[PDB]
Design an enzyme around this catalytic site. Structure first.
Site, PDB file in Angstrom:
ATOM      1  N   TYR A  59       0.849  -1.205   0.000  1.00 40.15           N
ATOM      2  CA  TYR A  59       0.000   0.000   0.000  1.00 40.15           C
ATOM      3  C   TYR A  59       0.868   1.232   0.000  1.00 40.15           C
ATOM      4  O   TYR A  59       1.944   1.207   0.544  1.00 40.15           O
ATOM      5  CB  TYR A  59      -0.900   0.051   1.246  1.00 40.15           C
ATOM      6  CG  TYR A  59      -2.088  -0.943   1.153  1.00 40.15           C
ATOM      7  CD1 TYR A  59      -3.304  -0.563   0.554  1.00 40.15           C
ATOM      8  CD2 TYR A  59      -1.974  -2.212   1.685  1.00 40.15           C
ATOM      9  CE1 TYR A  59      -4.429  -1.469   0.483  1.00 40.15           C
ATOM     10  CE2 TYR A  59      -3.041  -3.123   1.641  1.00 40.15           C
ATOM     11  CZ  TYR A  59      -4.259  -2.739   1.048  1.00 40.15           C
ATOM     12  OH  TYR A  59      -5.295  -3.654   1.042  1.00 40.15           O
ATOM     13  N   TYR A  94      -1.154 -10.074   0.742  1.00 38.01           N
ATOM     14  CA  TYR A  94      -0.063  -9.568   1.569  1.00 38.01           C
ATOM     15  C   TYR A  94      -0.153 -10.037   3.002  1.00 38.01           C
ATOM     16  O   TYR A  94      -1.237 -10.353   3.499  1.00 38.01           O
ATOM     17  CB  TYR A  94       0.026  -8.075   1.471  1.00 38.01           C
ATOM     18  CG  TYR A  94      -1.242  -7.405   1.894  1.00 38.01           C
ATOM     19  CD1 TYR A  94      -1.516  -7.189   3.237  1.00 38.01           C
ATOM     20  CD2 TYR A  94      -2.133  -6.971   0.921  1.00 38.01           C
ATOM     21  CE1 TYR A  94      -2.641  -6.580   3.639  1.00 38.01           C
ATOM     22  CE2 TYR A  94      -3.298  -6.333   1.275  1.00 38.01           C
ATOM     23  CZ  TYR A  94      -3.564  -6.134   2.647  1.00 38.01           C
ATOM     24  OH  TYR A  94      -4.723  -5.471   2.965  1.00 38.01           O
ATOM     25  N   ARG A 141      -3.493 -11.975   3.655  1.00 36.94           N
ATOM     26  CA  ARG A 141      -4.796 -11.653   3.051  1.00 36.94           C
ATOM     27  C   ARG A 141      -4.795 -12.152   1.572  1.00 36.94           C
ATOM     28  O   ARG A 141      -3.756 -12.090   0.879  1.00 36.94           O
ATOM     29  CB  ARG A 141      -4.950 -10.104   2.917  1.00 36.94           C
ATOM     30  CG  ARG A 141      -5.129  -9.282   4.187  1.00 36.94           C
ATOM     31  CD  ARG A 141      -6.190  -9.881   5.129  1.00 36.94           C
ATOM     32  NE  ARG A 141      -7.488 -10.228   4.522  1.00 36.94           N
ATOM     33  CZ  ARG A 141      -8.394  -9.420   3.951  1.00 36.94           C
ATOM     34  NH1 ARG A 141      -8.211  -8.105   3.853  1.00 36.94           N
ATOM     35  NH2 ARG A 141      -9.532  -9.962   3.483  1.00 36.94           N
ATOM     36  N   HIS A 195      -7.186  -8.542  -2.798  1.00 39.19           N
ATOM     37  CA  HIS A 195      -8.520  -7.986  -2.646  1.00 39.19           C
ATOM     38  C   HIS A 195      -8.494  -6.491  -2.954  1.00 39.19           C
ATOM     39  O   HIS A 195      -7.441  -5.843  -2.953  1.00 39.19           O
ATOM     40  CB  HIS A 195      -9.036  -8.155  -1.201  1.00 39.19           C
ATOM     41  CG  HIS A 195      -8.139  -7.490  -0.188  1.00 39.19           C
ATOM     42  ND1 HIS A 195      -6.920  -8.017   0.180  1.00 39.19           N
ATOM     43  CD2 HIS A 195      -8.234  -6.287   0.449  1.00 39.19           C
ATOM     44  CE1 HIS A 195      -6.304  -7.179   1.006  1.00 39.19           C
ATOM     45  NE2 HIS A 195      -7.076  -6.124   1.178  1.00 39.19           N
ATOM     46  N   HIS A 245     -10.678  -3.026  -1.793  1.00 37.85           N
ATOM     47  CA  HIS A 245     -11.592  -2.487  -0.802  1.00 37.85           C
ATOM     48  C   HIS A 245     -12.548  -1.577  -1.573  1.00 37.85           C
ATOM     49  O   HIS A 245     -12.133  -0.924  -2.514  1.00 37.85           O
ATOM     50  CB  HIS A 245     -10.837  -1.590   0.172  1.00 37.85           C
ATOM     51  CG  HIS A 245      -9.857  -2.330   1.053  1.00 37.85           C
ATOM     52  ND1 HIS A 245     -10.234  -2.909   2.248  1.00 37.85           N
ATOM     53  CD2 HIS A 245      -8.540  -2.602   0.893  1.00 37.85           C
ATOM     54  CE1 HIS A 245      -9.177  -3.519   2.788  1.00 37.85           C
ATOM     55  NE2 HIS A 245      -8.144  -3.349   1.981  1.00 37.85           N
TER      56      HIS A 245
HETATM   57 FE   LIG Z   1      -6.380  -4.453   2.398  1.00 33.44          FE
END
Ligand SMILES: [Fe+3]
Ligand SMILES: [Fe+3]
Ligand SMILES: [Fe+3]
Ligand SMILES: [Fe+3]
Lengths: 202, 238, 238, 202, 238, 202, 238, 202
Positions: free
Chosen positions: B106, B145, B155, B158, B160
């Site tokens: 991110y 990640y 995770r 995905h 969001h």
């Molecule tokens: Fe996330």
């Protein structure tokens, strides 16, 4: 009939997407923010601020908050408002903010809302609808902010009166303060534990 | 047609607030039950966002942050329809998305994973649904990640997403996954959802006829919001 | 025959105290585990109620509160047997019942539902089981009714009942439902019971051969209480 | 072998059926109530009173309570009592009451019970068995009331001694008070939380 | 589009005229076979009823006969769609309904059942379907009632309905029942219908999302009428 | 493709719902009835009457009857009529009646209909379409009423000629009578047995 | 205990009157439906027959008509219980039986079958059930026999029986068959019974433990009559 | 709960078993028959006779008939009679007969019964309950015989009045005749067809 898509937490980075400018990501020319007052907006300007605490009393520094409210005359800037009154044309009624990464403080600059009709001819006291998203919160939490200087109206509010524990009603009332000419309402939110804030299924 | 309230949210179709396998929820979930209220104008109204304020690349995550070149990763188009529970299209709803880059990283201060940052990828976009409830955006498929719940938690890939539509009661944030990702079966966040059929409602499906030759793949993903009932007798909303 | 203690209550056959889907239980359930004790004369004894004190219409909810006419609604007879877990009849047990009227409205101060009150219906009755554990009463079938748990919650039609029998350890209050009511499948109160077979143990069955022509329908419903074990070696009760 | 019928909450109207006269429903000539003292009943008259509190400390105003106890000589008015002693013939040993809708206070007029044999030749201290039903309570909650002026007997009570937390034992002891010549025992019940009352599986 | 005749009525989808288990049919059924005719303008036309003549409470059986108060019983909304066999909506069709009250008693001279009469309930209503074939009405759920076929016969709860639509050939009267009623399985009138799938076509389904909190339940029930075929070659109707 | 909803008998009270005013139920301001003649209606006024008999010859006193017919010029007051001629604007073409509870007699006041085109360029004799509902009748029974004074037209009627038993054709012809200046057509219906009326599947 | 009426006869558990495959029924079955009546003292009473009038061999078809020797054929004992539909024993009921001999021949004027007559066999017996509803009789197993329905029709082996018990409404005549007889599957008389489970209710079962060594076999066969309901409210019988 | 044993026809030889003496089978010392009058029986002696006809009008010569009736005072000789009156001790109330093989005639010698209470305080007219068994009859057929000289009582009989076809009620009334001092009631039974006798499900 279909089932509602299931909710999932916003996660710890709920601001890359919802407040990029403050994650220092310049992708959009027009950015949504926590200032609901435009120059010609009608009504009394107020600042709404507070912190959100977890079950151990620590402020959440990753929380995302939005508010939704009526204008100064209690009319919503929405096609779904059926009062047949004209809304303030310089008022979106919505805003979004995050908590300061260091302190955990969040705020909005907005106007004090007017009273909105309740069901079956009742009148609701002035309130702001608020929702909280964060890592660990699986579904956005809904609450409302009422104002301590509207005690007469609060006493007759349908929603507040529908809370049977009179001690929990007080968690929904923000406190008026006056910092250098500005009116400020302090509203702290306790997600869990003693003096836990009332949350609604709406 | 006079509208009444949104249908009650079916709590058994959503995760509970307290879900111990997702550790962060332990201290961030109310101990008291939620107080259900009958809806008023406050709950059935919501803001309107004008198309005028959106830029041309707001729904193109491949180009909206590209500076010297293109971001690295799998070019994919995601599209679908937003409707309410009674099947009606949700028009002019604001859809916002955010995600990691191809490395699972991110562009956020607090993300220190070793997966590499991509200088040409930002990771956020938005769009308004059209009159048929349709939306479309283009992006780079995100990588899965690691995160600390148990020490080796991962995770699945995905995206969001968030929707603001016609009524405040419809406000929803969630995440969708990609057909076939094997991590879907082990994620504690996805497992907070009680039923298998609802977990599958978050999986975007490969849409092969809609792939663009020598260019991009495509995934189909529809979203359902709460719907309003019509009133034919007493209208108690006001 | 020397009697020993009642068999242990099987907690997996009953609802737990804390059941979050039934919101009122959240603040009215102990945080500590129940303390199990070995039984004494206190737990194996119970009061005796004499038949002499009961009036002739105590088990006839159709007539016991009728003033100017008959109550409105479906005339039904409910009967069955009360036995203990080892199959023995429970004789002279006090059975008390209470319920809403045909509109789903209780003749209680706090009930403000719009379903109409019936001036000829009271909603409560009582009886003692006979030597075979048999009981019979007549009433108006109650209507389902709305309550606030989630905002649009509806209880299936039901009759509340209470039994005081031979031992204080047998003390039980519960509710029975009517075969085929579709609300049975959605009720959060009935769903506090963990197993499907125990939820079915609260459904009264249509008893067609026992209907009374041009008069009333009939439902069969049996009740099982805890049973006492016999002692053949040491008697430690005292 | 059969399974016990499953328990379900009594619900908020547990008095239409169990105390109709006080829901103002006159269906029965003879009504059951909270007065266990008949004119010839033997023993010392006492009043038992208190309130029932939820987890936030609010009294329940919808609760139904019953008590079961022995006579003045520690004999139960039940065919199942095997002491071979004669019981007081003017004593039912049972009563039922609701909390006052306004205050939440409940009470019974009864007699102080005599000591009852315990298992294996032991002797129990004087006690009253009590059960609570209400909306939100899925299974009736069983507890006992002991008396603070029977400290010597309480110290040797099998059941009290079987509670390993000596701090929880005290939640079962009511306090003697003397209001205008009348002896009163105050017994408050806390269903959940700090100083939560001990409940038994019997 | 030039319309031709209605499709032939499929007699195997309906009860036969002679059905001995329904005793009254024995002397009221023709001995001769029905004579099938090819349709003319007589069979494909029907009257038109203007909305102007309907009163505001014609479809509200709860209030249209209320005098001093509300009728006693279960408040329910019934709605659905009327379409033809090819799936087209039937617009502006006249729907009329009639039924017993909550006691299973009809406000008819000849009904002497002991179930109590309700002074605030009439039992009849009517409406016109809209442009989408939709209809909606509100009522009190009727109670089941005894009748003399065999001596202890009981009709399940039901609402009688009648439709006058676009063609005289579509004229239909029938009755619908409520999901889960156990009497549905034993009724000789419902059993005159030969197939199980057609018997299920008369059962109105619980529509839980459309219930109105603290007010009324809701049942969904659709109706299918015969449909007309289009003509593309010779038009022999005239 | 969908299957037609199955028919069920109207049952013995088919008038609470279809003729409330005559079951003495005043719910509607405007009530449907058996009078098809309005003051400006064109054509010759006629009264249609008769009784409906079961298989033992007993009149049904619980029967509901409706008729559907064209105006004086043979045009239907229906959007589905394709003759391109204008219909009498003061004519509904439909009515409903029940049999008198005592006698079993039913009647309608209407006008004698004009001839309507038949299929493939044929012409039908003047007729009224009639349907019967009652307890015991599982599906409404369709029949037609022709007039005995239209013998020439009846002889050439496509539908009547499609009945191969010339003795059954006569059951469809009503008899003209003249009671005090009024023209009356008597049409008795025999549901079952000797001289059983012809019923159609239309 | 105050008795009310017998439960309604369930017509679907019995043959219809008109059953075309059994040709003789075509002209001996009413065209009109049976008229159901509510019961009076006429229907709930019945005669009493004293045991004193029965002879010692009335239930022994092997010896009650034997003159010079024993009848030829298979020695069998038939026993069982008569109860009502609610399971109560039917005490002191009159059971009468009649049957053909081992050749399938009846000692009746009109029987001209070539199967041989047995001079030592009569073919009829009677008994009263005891306090437990038990009955027992001994006989020769009857042979199957030809009759004219279709030209080659054959009845399986069977014993005709008749019961007069407590109420006239219980009056019943029927026939039972023997386990395994292959003709049971083809008989038009047995096939007048609509359901397979009811046809099996007429088959007497081999009871091997009750055979008597070197003497006789044994068949078990129970009979169920209509039962009376108890009255707990109004007693309208009189 | 159990299902009633299914009925089956009595078949053509229903007299080997039910009237052996008249099939010339001497197995029993005491034989049941069609004579209900014993020497001390109280009441007026009557003879009941008739024939049973199939659908073509042919008498059945293989039929078995039984009757059940009250004594002269309307009391049944059954433990189930609850009138609390004493019954005639010399009256069985039941008999059985077959039709003469040649003629088809059947008869009983009995007494005219007294009126029996009906439901809810009503009074039934004098009647005899009758059942018919024969080859071709799958279930015994129940009917009743009323008397033409009890027209006043018949007019008020609950059961007769429950037959809606007044023309069918007459099939249940036998005709009084007086053959040489003896009173005879002729009751013919038509199983099928015109003037078919009413049969009941009781
Ligand atoms: Fe996330
Ligand atoms: Fe309840
Ligand atoms: Fe009906
Ligand atoms: Fe035979």
């Amino acid at each position: 009939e279909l089932k509602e898509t299931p909710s999932q937490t916003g996660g710890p980075y709920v601001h890359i997407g919802l407040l990029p400018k403050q994650a220092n990501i310049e992708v959009f020319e027009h950015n949504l923010d926590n200032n609901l007052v435009q120059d010609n907006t009608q009504g009394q300007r107020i600042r709404l601020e507070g912190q959100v605490f977890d079950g151990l009393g620590l402020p959440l520094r990753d929380v995302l908050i939005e508010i939704w409210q009526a204008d100064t005359n209690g009319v919503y800037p929405s096609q779904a408002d059926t009062q047949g009154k004209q809304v303030d044309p310089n008022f979106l009624g919505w805003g979004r903010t995050g908590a300061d990464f260091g302190t955990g403080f969040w705020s909005f600059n907005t106007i004090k809302p007017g009273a909105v009709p309740g069901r079956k001819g009742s009148t609701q006291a002035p309130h702001i609808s608020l929702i909280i998203f964060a890592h660990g919160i699986n579904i956005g939490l809904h609450t409302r902010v009422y104002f301590d200087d509207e005690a007469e109206a609060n006493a007759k509010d349908p929603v507040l009166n529908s809370i049977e524990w009179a001690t929990r009603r007080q968690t929904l009332v923000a406190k008026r303060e006056e910092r250098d000419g500005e009116v400020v309402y302090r509203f702290d939110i306790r997600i869990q534990g003693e003096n836990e804030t009332v949350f609604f299924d709406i | 047609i006079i509208w009444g309230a949104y249908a009650q949210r079916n709590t058994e179709d959503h995760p509970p607030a307290y879900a111990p396998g997702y550790k962060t929820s332990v201290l961030r979930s109310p101990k008291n039950a939620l107080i259900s209220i009958a809806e008023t104008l406050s709950e059935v109204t919501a803001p309107h966002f004008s198309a005028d304020k959106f830029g041309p690349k707001d729904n193109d995550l491949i180009l909206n942050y590209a500076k010297d070149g293109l971001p690295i990763g799998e070019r994919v188009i995601v599209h679908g329809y937003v409707r309410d529970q009674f099947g009606r299209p949700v028009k002019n709803a604001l859809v916002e998305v955010w995600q990691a880059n191809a490395s699972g990283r991110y562009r956020h201060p607090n993300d220190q994973y070793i997966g590499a940052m991509d200088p040409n990828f930002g990771g956020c976009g938005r769009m308004l649904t059209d009159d048929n409830g349709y939306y479309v955006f283009r992006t780079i498929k995100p990588g899965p990640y690691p995160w600390r719940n148990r020490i080796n938690e991962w995770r699945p890939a995905h995206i969001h997403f968030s929707l603001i539509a016609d009524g405040w009661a419809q406000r929803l944030i969630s995440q969708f996954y990609f057909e076939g990702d094997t991590l879907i079966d082990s994620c504690p966040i996805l497992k907070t959802i009680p039923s298998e059929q609802q977990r599958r409602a978050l999986i975007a499906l490969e849409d092969k006829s809609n792939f663009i030759e020598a260019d991009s793949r495509c995934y189909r993903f529809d979203i359902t919001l709460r719907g309003r009932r019509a009133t034919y007798f007493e209208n108690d909303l006001t």
